[PDB]
Amino acid sequence: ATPHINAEMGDFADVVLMPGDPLRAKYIAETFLEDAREVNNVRGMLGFTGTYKGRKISVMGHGMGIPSCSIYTKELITDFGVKKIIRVGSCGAVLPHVKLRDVVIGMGACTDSKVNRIRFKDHDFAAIADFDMVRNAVDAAKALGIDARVGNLFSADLFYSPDGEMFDVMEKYGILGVEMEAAGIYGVAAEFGAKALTICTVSDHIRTTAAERQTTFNDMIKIALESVLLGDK
Amino acid sequence: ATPHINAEMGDFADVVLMPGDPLRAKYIAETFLEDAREVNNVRGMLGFTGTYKGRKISVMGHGMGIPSCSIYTKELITDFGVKKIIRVGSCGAVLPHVKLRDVVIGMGACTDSKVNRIRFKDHDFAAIADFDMVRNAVDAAKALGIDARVGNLFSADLFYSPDGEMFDVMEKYGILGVEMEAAGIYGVAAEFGAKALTICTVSDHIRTHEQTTAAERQTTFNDMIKIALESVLLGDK
Amino acid sequence: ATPHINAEMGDFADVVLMPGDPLRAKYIAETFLEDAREVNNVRGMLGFTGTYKGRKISVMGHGMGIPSCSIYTKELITDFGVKKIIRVGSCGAVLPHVKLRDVVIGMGACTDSKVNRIRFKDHDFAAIADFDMVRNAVDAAKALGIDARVGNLFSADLFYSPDGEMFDVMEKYGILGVEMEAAGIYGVAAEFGAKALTICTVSDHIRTHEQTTAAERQTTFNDMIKIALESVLLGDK
Amino acid sequence: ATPHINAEMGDFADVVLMPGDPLRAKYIAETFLEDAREVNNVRGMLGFTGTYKGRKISVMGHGMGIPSCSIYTKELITDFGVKKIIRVGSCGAVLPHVKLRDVVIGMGACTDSKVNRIRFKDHDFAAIADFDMVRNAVDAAKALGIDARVGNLFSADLFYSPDGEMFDVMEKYGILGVEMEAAGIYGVAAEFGAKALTICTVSDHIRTHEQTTAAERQTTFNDMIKIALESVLLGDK
Amino acid sequence: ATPHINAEMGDFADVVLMPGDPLRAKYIAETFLEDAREVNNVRGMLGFTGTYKGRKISVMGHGMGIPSCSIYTKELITDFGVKKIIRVGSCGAVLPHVKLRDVVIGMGACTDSKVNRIRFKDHDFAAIADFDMVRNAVDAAKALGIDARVGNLFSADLFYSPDGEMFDVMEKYGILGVEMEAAGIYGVAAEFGAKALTICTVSDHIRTTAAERQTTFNDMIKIALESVLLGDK
Amino acid sequence: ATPHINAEMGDFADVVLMPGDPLRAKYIAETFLEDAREVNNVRGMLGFTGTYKGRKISVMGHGMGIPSCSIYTKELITDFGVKKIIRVGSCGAVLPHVKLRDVVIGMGACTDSKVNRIRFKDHDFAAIADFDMVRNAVDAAKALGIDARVGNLFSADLFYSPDGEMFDVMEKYGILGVEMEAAGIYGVAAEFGAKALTICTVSDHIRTHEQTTAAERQTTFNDMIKIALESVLLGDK
Ligand SMILES: O=c1[nH]cnc2c([C@@H]3O[C@H](CO)[C@@H](O)[C@H]3O)n[nH]c12
Ligand SMILES: O=c1[nH]cnc2c([C@@H]3O[C@H](CO)[C@@H](O)[C@H]3O)n[nH]c12
Ligand SMILES: O=c1[nH]cnc2c([C@@H]3O[C@H](CO)[C@@H](O)[C@H]3O)n[nH]c12
Ligand SMILES: O=c1[nH]cnc2c([C@@H]3O[C@H](CO)[C@@H](O)[C@H]3O)n[nH]c12
Ligand SMILES: O=c1[nH]cnc2c([C@@H]3O[C@H](CO)[C@@H](O)[C@H]3O)n[nH]c12
Ligand SMILES: O=c1[nH]cnc2c([C@@H]3O[C@H](CO)[C@@H](O)[C@H]3O)n[nH]c12
């Protein structure tokens, strides 16, 4: 139905989970979803639709960077009727107190991208997530025994930045984690009138064992899934 | 004491309520506080300290604009050991569904000011409030039967803006209300490692040019203050 | 009346003196004005009208920062028929030769604010004062035996600036003093077709961190006010 | 091995063909290369290494957008000894005379991204391709009897731009096609001292709305592939 | 002594008048100066040094645009010991009340150039002239019976601007005249610690007889020359 | 006739050689052209029209800086039917390996000017030359046994830049030479739909400080002249 998504209206649920890695999308569907069916494959950007505790939910990769996720997110909302978007991924930590395996919830998202400036007449647009979604995620985490940190994330355009000094600035301002999509997703949601949220796991420290990482990653997914159920009520 | 605050460490509580109008600060201290005492009068920016249900609380005006509030908030944090700041004021609505007397909670705050760019290497700094403070405010409101709206606020530098088209963009992006301090307070809090939040009551409709009434104002004003105060107690738990 | 000024057309003279501190406005009206009367108290921003040597003059505080002063200046011009605005305040010195208690006249005003960019299509708008007003001020000072310095001022948005290197640049470019309103007032005057000027007294040295004394302040303050008042008379000729 | 590439030094040839679609790389490898082998699959970003007319060559997808392609190109240059990068993608046409399926050579690349400004002290960095590479491609097209336009491309960050008027500006300036990565690739090449070039096939008209299908873009653009391949051989001689 | 000025220290007076047209520089020297000697010719940018009422003064063209005048001005101050610079030229009017042949004095200068931003950390630098020089010029004019307008000038980078809307903005903000060098000259003076001033004659209206124009032009020059004498005392 | 050119339609050839120095144009005309005639003298900006190997060609100075050359190039294109513009100037080298007297071909041009941003909605406009013209020049140099580097140039607004660190950035990005007009010329050509190209002779080293003399730059750079002239003939064939 779209140049980037070879699917039809109704193929996706009203809620969609989005990891950056398409392979991760498949992983999620196979692990947590029941009766998951492949719903998209153009450009290898795998998309699936299944059920979670009797609840219809979709999962689809978003690619790396603001421009990539911006395409997918907009299309989903606009052409597939998606109402809520939850980005599940990884991030780099700058804060000394922020440890590996920590779960971070992006209430807001700083960025070095020019996308929001283009949309906001060159002014300062505060890219924020949906309040309810944030609280639902916090509660869900709490129920699982996880203590998620809520704050600002930094969506970078350059993974390999020439400005190392920027990290000091981020630290000074309390940035929780460093990723590359949050701000873009928040911008699209506000622009198209949808609800978004971004959850990440500290994959590394800008300043563990395999089995350990994976456990936390799964925990993050569960938090996301559970938060959706909470929101339904 | 500081260049703008004629007080000493300990004169202020760990949390302070800040209205824009100094006159409102006196009203609050007299109406909701117990055993209140004046702690500042420099430049007529009245400040008081008292208790609310046994809890120590401070109240002081911040003036109009980011630059003004930035001065007070900074001093409070650095020289008075203030941990939480709650701004209570009015705002203009742009959203059709946003009605007068409505209560708005600024989870975030957009702005046309250059303050955050100066701080953030010219990048986009998302001026946000403390999550817990937001949650607490929402709960307190609910407990009082009030339906507060949580979203983005727009902190303007120019009350009398030469660019009216900006209002359309604001509406477009779902901004809840327009005021002139939020973004500055959030920037200061982040810079100094403090917690802040701004609650506003819809004073008028930027669109359908329709102002509220003194009566409605007074009442809604009281509610907002109740919400803020109660929210503090919740945060203490 | 206006949202910020509880007065009616005619309550204010064609020219108004504006200090930042409302308390200073009262002092001026009581000390230099004759048959003065209060015309505003909203938000504690005291305003008065009286005469000086038979000449009708008004005095009112403007608060701190560009956004604050922008509101008052705009209202005065548009709703009160004010033709000339004279800001009288303090400033910080960056220039080694610029000594404390020194009188500075802002012919122009640099700034880190975004207000003029919003007005000027993002280009460089030179915020300047009225030439005649500058000349008059210089003459009045001379007549009083005071040696006023005429140059550029720097209107800052952040009193507590995170970028200290900016001071070196200021020094480099010969800026006379740093305050927080000039650029905003000049922008408003140009936008509404009014005349403005800002006179400041060196309160402290940004560099050799050295503040003035209450005594020296009071005296120098009086001189500045004398200069401003006398300058008005000259302009009337 | 790198964080985004599960390969080792030697797996990649000195020159790499890069389409945005990993599926297109697979197609290229299986249809144009000889004895091609999969050298990368991380994130599904297929990468292959085969032979073309005796010449060792690689093919790998770069994803959509400047931030995506920036990562891959950098790693290739720094950890795989890649010296030349040839992007082979699609683009939207703005010019009336620019018909579909047309082949455009990006000698230069405009952009709305902030990446180059970050590297260039906020100045204007002209993102250009390697001259030799451009010429090689021009001659190759000539030899294949294929018409190819050489000019400026526009690397957009927003496929779904809110600024429609921008298209009129692009048209006025003669931009040949609108894509999403050229400028980023050119910036990386200059930063890491490598040679790059971008070739595109008009896959749609922003004006008319004559977009092609996915399957199309995925396996239909052979012409541009030939040019790229042939251009490499020329560079060798 | 310099790549743009083939002269030696002492060849120029401490004060120099600068028109945009080199041919105009020659014209000034021949008309108002006594014993004027050619002091520079590289690039055809004529420079002369003579006397005016027994006062040593120089005259040299500056070229069109901020970048051109910036070179000349800096060199003069830095390598020739010049202390005061007076630009004498023409400008376009935007204000309805601003008539042709009117004499405008640039107390300040707005601009669309990025030069001052580069110098001022991207902030707003108010490019202004020297106060004394302004007053001296005002007085001089008054003595000649001319009523000069004192205000803001607009130094444009693009003579042939693609932004016609800018003219409305200028008008709204009270811009007196439109030229292309003032801001640049003011920037250099502040940077190198010198004194500058710009005087112009409304050559045209963005909204007369030859003999008329010329008379006013001469008047402007006289004002400039006289203002210098005033400053000497 | 135009406001800056005292000539008439027909006085100029379809292609024009433009040096910054009017004196250099005179030199070119008298040393390389046949039966050359002065077609312009306004402002001393000498312009001539002669013949080269039977080919009608013009030569005219453009002055120093983007704003200067912008005026001349525009008028030429719009009122004199000029189709091709070849700038022949000097430049300062930043690269260590870039020796003096070297000939550089500006395929692209970076800049610190705000002109292109004004035309390009504040985005990044890649100022590039005409491909054919570049190739023609490359072949011409080859035929004359002259070595010529093709790459990016940097069009500066400030010859005497306050930002010395900018040179390190230029060096890192491989800029071939620093001049003051290429980017402006390229912008005009695109705006008015004309073809342009800039060739330069290294007249000094920003690093070493090996600058040449005025007389030099004025009549010594023959090599670049030949290339330009010869390149025109190629374009004809
Ligand atoms: O330390 C980090 N920095 C930047 N991005 C990331 C990411 C995420 O992983 C991808 C980069 O490999 C991006 O999609 C980004 O969102 N994880 N960890 C980091
Ligand atoms: O419609 C509005 N626009 C902008 N600011 C405000 C405000 C608030 O009131 C003051 C100005 O009236 C500012 O301090 C601001 O916080 N109320 N209503 C509005
Ligand atoms: O050193 C200084 N810096 C910035 N502003 C000021 C000011 C003035 O005083 C107030 C803040 O103290 C502002 O209103 C400003 O106008 N005085 N001294 C300084
Ligand atoms: O009309 C268009 N506009 C913008 N980008 C593209 C693209 C290219 O294809 C992908 C988006 O579909 C991006 O990688 C981009 O480079 N194709 N067609 C268009
Ligand atoms: O109407 C006008 N617009 C822009 N510049 C000028 C000028 C001056 O003349 C030259 C443009 O021809 C520039 O050097 C500029 O300073 N005169 N009249 C005008
Ligand atoms: O080292 C240099 N830097 C900057 N511009 C130039 C120039 C050129 O020569 C003139 C300045 O001398 C300008 O027209 C400019 O293009 N030559 N050498 C240099």
- Distances in whole angstroms, Cα of residue E184 to Cα of each of E155, E190, E220: 8, 10, 21
Measured by CA distance, the residue closest to atom 9 of ligand 2 is B90
Query: In degrees, to the nearest 5, what angle opens at C-alpha C89 toward C-alphas C84 and C93?
Result: 125
The Cα E44–Cα A210 span in angstroms is 75
The Cα F223–Cα F234 span in angstroms is 17
The Cα F41–Cα E100 span in angstroms is 26
Kindly list the domain boundaries of chain A, sorted by start residue.
1-233
Contact D131/F152, CB-based, under 8 Å? no
The token duo for A197 is 């949220």
Report the candidate in E184, E174, E124, E183 with the shortest Cα–Cα distance to residue E151.
E174
Helices A131-143, A210-232: inter-axial angle, 10-degree rounding: 120
The token duo for B162 is 């030469």
- Asked if A205 contacts A92 with a C-beta cutoff of 8 angstroms, the reply is yes
Handedness of CA A106, A109, A115, A117 (dihedral sign): positive
- In E, minimum Cα distance to C152 occurs at E126
The Cα E63–Cα C54 span in angstroms is 54
Residues 6+ apart with CB under 8 A from B10: none
Of the residues F42, F60, F68, the best mutation for testing chain E's interface (the one with the most E CB atoms within 10 Å of its CB) is F68
- Distances in whole angstroms, Cα of residue D35 to Cα of each of D29, D42, D222, E100: 9, 21, 19, 80
E170, amino acid identity: M
The Cα D49–Cα D33 span in angstroms is 8
- Asked if C128 contacts E152 with a C-beta cutoff of 8 angstroms, the reply is yes
Helices E22-32, E210-232: inter-axial angle, 10-degree rounding: 70
The residues with which C16 forms a beta bridge, in sequence order, are C58, C85
What DSSP element (H or E) covers A75? helix A66-80
The Cα F82–Cα F196 span in angstroms is 11
Q: Say how many C-beta atoms besides its own lie within 10 A of residue E211's C-beta.
A: 7
- Asked if C106 contacts C200 with a C-beta cutoff of 8 angstroms, the reply is yes
D191, amino acid identity: E
The Cα F125–Cα D169 span in angstroms is 11
Transcribe chain C into DSSP letters: --SS----TTSS-SEEEE-SSHHHHHHHHHHT-EEEEEEE-GGG--EEEEEETTEEEEEE---SSHHHHHHHHHHHHHHH---EEEEEEEEEE-STT--TT-EEEEEEEEES-SHHHHHTTTSB---B--HHHHHHHHHHHHHTT---EEEEEEE-S-TT-S-TTHHHHHHHTT--EEESSHHHHHHHHHHHT-EEEEEEEEEEETTTTEE--HHHHHHHHHHHHHHHHHHHHHHH-
- Asked if F131 contacts D134 with a C-beta cutoff of 8 angstroms, the reply is yes
CATH class of the domain whose range is F1-237: alpha beta
- Asked if F137 contacts F231 with a C-beta cutoff of 8 angstroms, the reply is yes
The residues with which E87 forms a beta bridge, in sequence order, are E18, E198
The token duo for F34 is 């046949």
Q: Which residue has the tokens 């023609």?
A: F136
Residue F160: exposed, middle, or buried by beta-carbon count in 10 A (0-12, 13-18, 19+)? middle
Q: Is A204 in the pocket of ligand 1 (CB under 6 A)?
A: yes
Q: Could you tell me which residues of chain A have a Cβ less than 8 Å from any Cβ in chain D?
A: 3-4, 6, 20-23, 42-46, 61, 63-68, 70-71, 74, 112-115, 118-119, 156-163, 180, 191
- In F, minimum Cα distance to D155 occurs at F124
Measured by CA distance, the residue closest to atom 17 of ligand 6 is F91
Between E and F, how many residue pairs show a Cβ–Cβ distance under 8 A?
A: 118
- Asked if C227 contacts C220 with a C-beta cutoff of 8 angstroms, the reply is no
Report the candidate in C110, B219, F178 with the shortest Cα–Cα distance to residue E126.
C110
Q: Is F89 annotated as a binding residue?
A: yes
Of the residues B95, B97, B118, B125, the best mutation for testing chain A's interface (the one with the most A CB atoms within 10 Å of its CB) is B125
Partner chains of A (3+ C-beta pairs under 8 Å): B, D
Measured by CA distance, the residue closest to atom 2 of ligand 2 is B92
The Cα C150–Cα E126 span in angstroms is 14
Residues 6+ apart with CB under 8 A from B66: B111, B113, B115, B155, B157, B180, B181, B183, B184, C65, C67, C157
The token duo for F199 is 């060739």
In 3-state terms chain B splits into helix, strand, coil percentages (rounded to 5) of 35, 30, 35
Q: At residue A32, what are phi and psi to the nearest 5 degrees?
A: -105, -20
The Cα C46–Cα C43 span in angstroms is 8
The token duo for B92 is 């203009």
E127, amino acid identity: A
Report the candidate in F7, F186, F3, F183 with the shortest Cα–Cα distance to residue F81.
F7
Residue D209: exposed, middle, or buried by beta-carbon count in 10 A (0-12, 13-18, 19+)? exposed
- Exposure string for B174-194, b = 16+ CB within 10 A, e = fewer: ebbbbbbbbbbbbbbbbbeeb
CATH topology for E1-233? Rossmann fold (3.40.50)
Alpha carbon B79 to chain centroid, angstroms = 20
Between A and B, how many residue pairs show a Cβ–Cβ distance under 8 A?
A: 100
The residues with which E15 forms a beta bridge, in sequence order, are E84
Handedness of CA C99, C102, C104, C109 (dihedral sign): positive
Of the residues F128, F152, F172, the best mutation for testing chain D's interface (the one with the most D CB atoms within 10 Å of its CB) is F128
DSSP 8-class letter at F43: G
Chains B and F touch (3+ CB pairs under 8 A): no
The Cα D185–Cα D85 span in angstroms is 9
The Cα D90–Cα D103 span in angstroms is 9
Handedness of CA F212, F215, F220, F225 (dihedral sign): positive
**Which of D102, D154, D179 has the most ligand 4 atoms within 8 A of CB, as the residue to mutate?**
D179
* F148 SS3 class: strand
Q: At residue E9, what are phi and psi to the nearest 5 degrees?
A: -55, 125
What DSSP element (H or E) covers A50? strand A47-52
Q: At residue C219, what are phi and psi to the nearest 5 degrees?
A: -65, -60
Q: Could you tell me which residues of chain B have a Cβ less than 8 Å from any Cβ in chain A?
A: 107-113, 116-117, 119-121, 123-128, 131-132, 134-135, 138, 150-152, 163, 165-166, 169, 172-174, 183, 190-191, 193
- Asked if A225 contacts A125 with a C-beta cutoff of 8 angstroms, the reply is no
Residue C193: exposed, middle, or buried by beta-carbon count in 10 A (0-12, 13-18, 19+)? exposed
Experimental technique used to determine this entry: X-ray
Transcribe D145-158 into DSSP letters: T--EEEEEEEE-S-
- Asked if A221 contacts A88 with a C-beta cutoff of 8 angstroms, the reply is yes
D71, amino acid identity: I
The Cα E212–Cα C116 span in angstroms is 38
Q: At residue E23, what are phi and psi to the nearest 5 degrees?
A: -65, -30
